[PDB]
């Protein structure tokens, strides 16, 4: 079965940097893109960007052009997300989601990680 195992909770000081991991299993990791979404408390879902593990192509949201950078470890079949310059508004739940490497009518988020609760406080 397709399973996306994500890192876990992490409290982190302001100004620091954090690295969320999403580990895949049950499917071949190289021919599916890997997306990241943000959900603040009581709010809606915001898109961040994706990465293709085969081609290392990255398309991202320009609201997160200074916050998020994305990378892939091909050996462990894990996708990473590095959050930089953590302010208070970065306290949210982050999900990883599978998507096709193309755009057709089928191309949706068919599998999701369990989430990671990230709290920027002290």
């Amino acid at each position: 079965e397709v399973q996306l195992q994500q890192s876990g909770p992490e409290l982190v000081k302001p100004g620091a940097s954090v690295k969320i991991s999403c580990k895949a299993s049950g499917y071949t990791f190289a021919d599916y893109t890997m997306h990241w979404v943000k959900q603040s408390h009581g709010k809606s879902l915001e898109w961040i960007g994706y990465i293709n593990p085969y081609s290392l192509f990255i398309d991202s949201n320009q609201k997160f052009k200074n916050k998020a950078t994305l990378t892939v470890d091909n050996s462990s079949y894990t996708a990473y997300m590095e959050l930089r310059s953590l302010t208070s508004e970065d306290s949210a739940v982050y999900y990883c989601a599978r998507f096709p490497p193309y755009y057709g009518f089928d191309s949706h988020f068919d599998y999701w990680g369990q989430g990671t609760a990230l709290t920027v406080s002290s």
């Binding site: 879902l45 949706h108 068919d110 999701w112 990680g113």
Partner: peptide, 15 residues
């Protein structure tokens, strides 16, 4: 809980 895919391509039901 995580989000789940519900309807894609405006009419097609998910798994």
């Amino acid at each position: 809980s995580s989000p789940k895919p519900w309807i894609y391509a405006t009419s097609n039901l998910a798994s």
